[PDB]
């Protein structure tokens, strides 16, 4: 639902949805993606983070992005 062209905030909101869709708390979700919980919160809130941090979570949750 709501689909998206992707921006920084919706991407963060997308991660929260995939995380919640998988029934995962932020602390366990953070550890498997190789980041701190606070950093994962920053990502979900769309707060500025390193591109590498986002890719760790992207690769981790098995979510793929492509150029339209």
């Amino acid at each position: 639902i709501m689909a998206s062209p992707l921006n920084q905030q919706s991407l963060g909101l997308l991660i929260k949805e995939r995380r919640k869709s998988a029934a995962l708390t932020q602390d366990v979700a953070a550890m498997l993606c190789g980041v701190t919980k606070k950093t994962l919160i920053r990502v979900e809130k769309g707060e500025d983070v390193y591109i590498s941090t986002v890719f760790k979570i992207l690769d981790g949750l098995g979510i793929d992005i492509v150029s339209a």
Binding site: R18, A23, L24, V28, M31, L32, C33, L61, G62
Partner: protein
């Protein structure tokens, strides 16, 4: 020489067997090649699945017990002919794929209801109705379940439940308690209930690769593969030590290990969701005393987007039975003895999986603490109990808490252990 592959009532491809070259070939329809998913990761859609991988995958669908010998003897074929065995069991197998010989179906379809009188006579004398240590044994049957009467499903309709009987003491009670505990703990696990036949008790397990559509005659299947078919392993590799417990063979592990199990996370839809499910599966089996957890006890749904872990099934505490050899079928840091597991084994284990130790402690601590209040809950989910059975659960209860308190003691040391 050619068996068609059917998904439900629909034909998704063809399984070819060349008798002369003793070879298997699986090629798929074109519509399925783009939009579909392969039998296993090792039998791709382009038809590049090796004959060996196909063969092992088919063999992985057959029974390992006397039922195997009952099937080959009923048809009167050799152990070495798999082709005849598949085509026979083709309509109903694990997963959503039914293997159909070309142009042959009853169907018709209908049903065969069951009476309590025929099962009780089929309970008491195993000879009439076709020793060191442990695998199984155990009795079981696959059946159609409407909520009231059990029946044999025929044709396109298939058994939606597996009813399991206890020849050995309190096997039904053991698995029911443990399976229920997982569900009560919030784990993802197939739904199980106890059912009564005469004086004898049975365990009715709901199949998640089958869904009964109410209101008419059909049974909808969802495809699944075990960790063996996924890793492309022979049926022999179900245990991490693929030969035996022997001291000369103790050092041979070609089978499924935890590192090999977790490796499948990458192919799953959600690698993170699986890896916790993987570890919870490990940690749960440690706390409940399940040493029999092996490759065919953990399975995945097959979809075009990727694999997904199934709900857990066949969860049993073997520590209850001391007439059996109990070693973890999947080791923790090269330590197979459940009683020799300490902070170090766990620390080096997670390190082996390349996962943070703080995560084990989190999951281990959370589950082990919630068990004491959760075990009491399961006891209430039990049907009427006799005195001997109440004594069993008492022993069950006691040593369950013993595993929890034992692990809960040294768990704090895992963080600081230097390997």
């Amino acid at each position: 020489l050619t068996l068609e592959m059917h998904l439900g009532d629909l034909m998704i491809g063809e399984l070819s067997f060349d008798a002369t070259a003793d070879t298997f070939a699986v090629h798929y329809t074109k519509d399925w090649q783009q939009s579909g998913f392969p039998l296993s990761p090792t039998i791709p859609l382009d038809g590049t699945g090796t004959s060996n991988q196909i063969s092992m995958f088919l063999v992985n669908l057959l029974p390992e017990n006397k039922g195997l010998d009952y099937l080959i003897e009923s048809l009167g074929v050799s152990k070495g002919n798999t082709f005849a065995l598949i085509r026979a069991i083709g309509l109903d197998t694990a997963g959503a794929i039914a293997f159909v010989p070309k142009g042959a179906l009853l169907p018709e379809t209908q049903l065969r209801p069951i009476k309590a009188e025929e099962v009780i006579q089929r309970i008491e004398d195993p000879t009439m109705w076709p020793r060191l240590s442990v695998a199984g044994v155990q009795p079981k049957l696959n059946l159609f379940y409407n909520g009231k009467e059990f029946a044999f499903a025929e044709g396109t309709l298939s058994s939606t439940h597996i009813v399991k009987f206890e020849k050995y003491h309190h096997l039904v009670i053991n698995e029911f308690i443990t399976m229920r505990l997982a569900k009560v703990l919030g784990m993802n696990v197939a739904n199980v209930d106890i059912v009564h036949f005469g004086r004898y008790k049975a365990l009715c397990v709901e199949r998640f690769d089958r869904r009964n559509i109410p209101g008419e005659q059909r049974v909808l299947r969802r495809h699944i593969v075990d960790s063996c078919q996924a890793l492309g392993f022979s049926v022999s590799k179900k245990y991490e030590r693929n030969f035996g417990t022997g001291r000369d063979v103790k050092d041979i592990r070609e089978g499924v290990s935890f590192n090999r199990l977790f490796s499948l996370a990458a192919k799953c839809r959600n690698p993170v969701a699986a890896k916790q499910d993987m570890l919870q599966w490990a940690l749960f089996n440690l706390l409940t005393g399940n040493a029999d957890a092996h490759g065919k006890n953990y399975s995945f749904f097959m979809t075009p987007s990727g694999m997904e872990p199934t709900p857990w099934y066949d969860l049993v505490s073997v520590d209850m039975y001391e007439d059996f050899e109990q070693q973890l079928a999947m080791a923790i840091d090269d330590e197979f003895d459940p009683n020799s597991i300490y902070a170090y084994q766990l620390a080096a284990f997670m390190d082996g999986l390349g996962l943070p130790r703080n995560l084990l402690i989190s999951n281990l601590t959370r589950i082990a603490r919630r068990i004491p209040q959760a075990i009491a809950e399961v006891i209430l989910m039990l049907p009427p109990l006799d005195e001997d059975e109440a004594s069993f659960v008492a022993h069950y209860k006691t040593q369950l808490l013993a595993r929890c308190e034992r692990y809960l003691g040294f768990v704090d040391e895992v963080r600081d252990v230097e390997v």
